[PDB]
Structure formats: structure tokens, C-alpha cells
């Protein structure tokens, strides 16, 4: 019940369905996670209701309806990022996404109203150029796109931030069961899932794999929009993909480079900056 | 102020630079310091009426340390070269940064903090960043980066110990400079000798051989050397290196605006890195926890 747990399980986890992702390389995953995450939700919370004397439940359609949202950010959300692909070659494409640590960082303090110091917002910034150098082409044509693919990389960037900080709303605006709010929002979630399709083929161990590790990480973000923020989540991503970079090294045998070295360096840095306590940053 | 210092010795580290672009020198460079530090000497001997001057040999002797160094480090230099490529050792040449910020605690025995000394490694990585190869290509022999490393530790303590002996007495800035550059002189000097001697003397008179362009660089080198020497007094060794760092920075966007040179986003990076890591060090750190 640590946050610090959740959060290292949420890097371990994020980077296993990174390399599960790859492992399964010669769909419905999405759909499937989903129905994971809503019956694992469902699951604890009859459990709940069955074990305790008290579950704070709000079934209040003025609150409930609210859980759409993230759904339907996160629907237009892939419809730009395969725009985007469409302009961007996927390496400009990948280090332009580097922009949503910082946009979550602005909309933490704009719409979660939250305040930084200094040294904070130095750590965002840090973190997401640290990423960004380790992604940057080890010894491809970045700055050669359409106007398009830039503004289009940058809004993909501005949607996912917010999709990310309005379910940290939806959490915290209430005293409510994690178990129920996680059955509301992947409600929907599985419905926007089916609308889409709407609108197995060789189903591995491997691909089953992936699907209870979406499914693991999903709840686990949503743990760390209740009980902790969302720069923390992206702190924790961040460092997913950095220890997969560094996996795929004795893994996959890619090339290590001096790039990878180095965005490590800033981002271990950019975390001390963020979530040293500010007597220990002064000695 | 220091800063001002600190900015114009950015402005003209960049400057010789470019100058570069466009090596007895060293010799004119160290007679130019050595002159104008001694006219300046002399004129505050005349113009005040005690000036502190060291004249014991327990103190002056110590003016020779510096171009020992500097003398094993060019060597070592030139003896590294021979095992890596040119960009290999420019980029192991970020290392001083880290080797004068240890050597800054250890010799200097200065006070850092934790957040400081997060920016004198933030530094070296963002001047890193900006010089690592992007898309000639032989990083990644160990005497190469053994001796890259050890050119580092030289070259810091060279800058180190010339801190010393400034901030070691109280004495006058331009007879501290006199004694410093009188030994530079004789060393630079001596390898001219040397030099004439290794090619037998059968080129033109020793003291015979002895554009404009050229001698601005000769000018520009004379002067950042006398900026540094008034920071190892007045100012300590790391505003020197954040100097030089963000001189090497300025000569890479300089370079797109007047060479017209390959732009690249570690270019842009590294800049954004060392930006970060000069407020992390220079900041108040009541102004690091401000909203």
C-alpha cells in the first residue's frame, strides 16, 4: 500500500508488456485488457461489499456519467496518433511523445490546480529531454516533416496528458471505492472498446500473457490516480523505458549507446530533483 | 562582478574559436600575459603605496606546478590522439568538468551541495549530449580512454592548483600573474628550443623564425587567459568551467548562423540540460523551492 511499491511495480510491468509486446512479433488485446480490468474491479468490489460494514459508492448519474470522458479523449487520442504516423516517421514520432511528460506536468498545475517549485519543474522539463536523448538515433530524417505531423504530435501529446489527469479527477473528487470507480470507468471503457469494433487468430500463451500484464499495469495506474498523481505515473513510465532499452541490451543484443548512458544519468537525476525532500536537496 | 568576467570570458572562448577556424602562438599568447600582467604590476607599484608581493622561494617555486602539468598534460594529449579519433577525444574532454568539481572538493576543500553537484554532472552530460555523434564513428583500445581520463585529472589540476596559489596569499593579482607566466614563458620557450633542436636547427635562424587574423587569435588567446587567472583569484574553478562549457555551446549555434553547420537536436538538447544545470547551481536555494 506503499505508493513508491505501486509505482516500481508499475515500471517492472510496463516494461514486461514491452518486451511481451515484441516477444509476440511472428488486435483485440485492447478489448480483452479491458474486460480484465472491469472483472478484476468487479471481482474486489462484490468481494468488498460482501466483506466490509461500509463501501462509499456514488451512483449518482450527475457523477457517474463523468467516466465517458477518458474514454472518448482516449478514442480521438489513437484516431491523431495514427494521423500523426501518416506525416511522421515512427522515430520523430516517438521522440515528438516525449512532449506529454510536460504536458501533464502544465495541466497537473492548470487542471488539477496543484502547485511545483522550481526545482519540480526543472525535473519535468529534465525528464523529458532525458528520454528524448536516449531515443535520439544511435550512430531515419527528424526536422523533415509536414507542418501537419508537428501539430499533430503535439496535440496527440495534449490529449494523452489530459486523458491521464481528468481519471486523477474522477478519482480523487470523490471518497469512493477504488473498486467502483475502476468498475465505472472500465465500463465504459469496454463499451467504447465494442463501439469501435462495432464501427483468438492464433491467441498464444504469450498473447495471454500481454493480456493480464495491460490489464496488471491499467489497475495500477488507476491505484496511482487515487492515492498518487499523475507525475508520479509518468515517472514511473518513463522509467519503464529505460530499463527496456537496457533489457533489450542482454535480451535482444541492441546496440548500446552513449545516448542511452547519458538520458539515464539525467533522468536518475530528473527523479532525485522531483522527489528529493527539500532538506536533503540542501546540505 | 564575476558574472560579467564569467560572461565575457563565454564571449571570447567562443571568439577564439571561430578565430581558430579562420601553433607557435602559445608563446606570443604567454608573452602578451606575461607583458601586460607586468605593465599593470609595475603601474600599482608606482600608483599605490604598498603593494603585497611573496618574494620567498617557498612561495614563488610554486609557480613552476602549473606548467609542469600543463607541459606533461599537452603530451598526454598528443599521446591520446594516437589511439582515438579527434571526436573521441573532444568528447572524453568532458570529463575536466567532473575531475575539477571532485578536485575543487579534495584540493580546494570547497562546499557543495547535493544540488550543485547534481549540475557539475548535469553539466558534463549536456556538453556530452551536444557533441555525441549522431547519424568519425569509433566510440563504443584502453590505453585510449585510460589516458582520455587521465588528460582530464591533469588538466583539473592544473586549473585547480593555479586556484591555490592565487587564493593561497593575499598578495597582488598581476605578481601572482608575473611569477605564473614568467615560468609559462620559459616552458614555451624551452620547447621552441626544443623543437628547432629536434628538427637539427636547419631551417632558418632560431631567432629570425622567432596575417592580422593571426594575431587577433594571438590577442584573444592572451586575453581569456587573463579572464581565468582572475577567476582562480576572485572566482573559483567551476564558474570557470560553466564558462568554457557554455563558450563550446556558443560556437556550435554560431557556427549554424555564419558557417551555416549541421543543426541537430542534440544540439538543441544539450543546451536545455546545461540552461537547467547552470540555475541548479548558480540558484538560491530558497529561489529552487519558490512557487
Same mark, same amino acid.
Not at 496535440?155 to 486523458?163: G, M, P, Q, R
Not at 478519482?171 to 483468438?200: A, H
Not at 523505458?241 to 544519468?265: D, E, N, P, R, W
Given at each position: 500500500?506503499?505508493?513508491?511499491?505501486?509505482?516500481?511495480?508499475?515500471?517492472?510491468?510496463?516494461?514486461?508488456?514491452?518486451?511481451?509486446?515484441?516477444?509476440?512479433?511472428?488486435?483485440?488485446?485492447?478489448?480483452?485488457?479491458?474486460?480484465?480490468?472491469?472483472?478484476?474491479?468487479?471481482?474486489?468490489?462484490?468481494?468488498?461489499?460482501?466483506?466490509?460494514?461500509?463501501?462509499?459508492?456514488?451512483?449518482?448519474?450527475?457523477?457517474?456519467?463523468?467516466? #465517458?470522458?477518458?474514454?472518448?479523449?482516449? %478514442? &480521438?487520442?489513437? !484516431?491523431?496518433?495514427?494521423? +500523426?504516423?501518416?506525416? *511522421?516517421?515512427?522515430?520523430?514520432?516517438?521522440?515528438?511523445?516525449?512532449?506529454?511528460?510536460?504536458?501533464?506536468?502544465?495541466?497537473?498545475?492548470?487542471?488539477?490546480?496543484?502547485?511545483?517549485?522550481?526545482?519540480?519543474?526543472?525535473?519535468?522539463?529534465?525528464?523529458?529531454?532525458?528520454?528524448?536523448?536516449?531515443?535520439?538515433?544511435?550512430?531515419?530524417?527528424?526536422?523533415?516533416?509536414?507542418?501537419?505531423?508537428?501539430?499533430?504530435?503535439?496535440?496527440?501529446?495534449?490529449?494523452?496528458?489530459?486523458?491521464?489527469?481528468?481519471?486523477?479527477?474522477?478519482?480523487?473528487?470523490?471518497?469512493?471505492?477504488?473498486?467502483?470507480?475502476?468498475?465505472?470507468?472500465?465500463?465504459?471503457? #469496454?463499451?467504447?472498446?465494442?463501439?469501435? %469494433? &462495432?464501427?483468438? !487468430?492464433?491467441?498464444?500463451? +504469450?498473447?495471454?500473457? *500481454?493480456?493480464?500484464?495491460?490489464?496488471?499495469?491499467?489497475?495500477?495506474?488507476?491505484?496511482?490516480?487515487?492515492?498518487?498523481?499523475?507525475?508520479?505515473?509518468?515517472?514511473?513510465?518513463?522509467?519503464?523505458?529505460?530499463?527496456?532499452?537496457?533489457?533489450?541490451?542482454?535480451?535482444?543484443?541492441?546496440?548500446?549507446?552513449?545516448?542511452?548512458?547519458?538520458?539515464?544519468?539525467?533522468?536518475?537525476?530528473?527523479?532525485?530533483?522531483?522527489?528529493?525532500?527539500?532538506?536533503?536537496?540542501?546540505?
Amino acid at each position: 500500500m506503499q505508493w513508491y511499491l505501486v509505482a516500481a511495480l508499475l515500471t517492472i510491468l510496463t516494461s514486461s508488456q514491452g518486451i511481451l509486446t515484441t516477444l509476440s512479433q511472428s488486435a483485440t488485446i485492447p478489448f480483452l485488457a479491458e474486460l480484465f480490468k472491469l472483472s478484476v474491479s468487479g471481482f474486489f468490489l462484490w468481494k468488498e461489499c460482501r466483506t466490509s460494514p461500509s463501501v462509499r459508492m456514488t451512483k449518482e448519474w450527475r457523477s457517474v456519467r463523468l467516466y #465517458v470522458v477518458p474514454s472518448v479523449i482516449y %478514442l &480521438i487520442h489513437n !484516431n491523431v496518433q495514427f494521423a +500523426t504516423l501518416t506525416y *511522421v516517421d515512427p522515430s520523430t514520432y516517438q521522440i515528438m511523445g516525449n512532449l506529454k511528460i510536460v504536458t501533464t506536468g502544465i495541466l497537473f498545475r492548470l487542471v488539477l490546480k496543484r502547485k511545483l517549485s522550481n526545482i519540480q519543474w526543472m525535473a519535468i522539463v529534465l525528464l523529458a529531454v532525458g528520454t528524448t536523448t536516449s531515443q535520439v538515433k544511435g550512430c531515419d530524417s527528424l526536422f523533415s516533416a509536414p507542418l501537419e505531423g508537428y501539430l499533430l504530435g503535439i496535440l496527440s501529446a495534449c490529449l494523452s496528458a489530459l486523458a491521464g489527469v481528468y481519471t486523477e479527477y474522477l478519482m480523487k473528487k470523490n471518497n469512493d471505492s477504488l473498486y467502483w470507480q475502476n468498475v465505472q470507468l472500465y465500463t465504459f471503457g #469496454v463499451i467504447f472498446n465494442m463501439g469501435w %469494433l &462495432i464501427y483468438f !487468430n492464433g491467441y498464444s500463451i +504469450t498473447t495471454w500473457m *500481454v493480456v493480464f500484464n495491460l490489464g496488471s499495469t491499467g489497475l495500477l495506474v488507476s491505484w496511482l490516480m487515487k492515492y498518487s498523481d499523475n507525475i508520479v505515473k509518468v515517472y514511473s513510465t518513463s522509467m519503464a523505458m529505460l530499463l527496456t532499452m537496457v533489457l533489450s541490451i542482454y535480451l535482444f543484443s541492441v546496440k548500446a549507446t552513449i545516448q542511452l548512458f547519458l538520458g539515464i544519468i539525467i533522468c536518475i537525476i530528473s527523479l532525485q530533483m522531483y522527489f528529493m525532500p527539500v532538506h536533503m536537496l540542501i546540505e
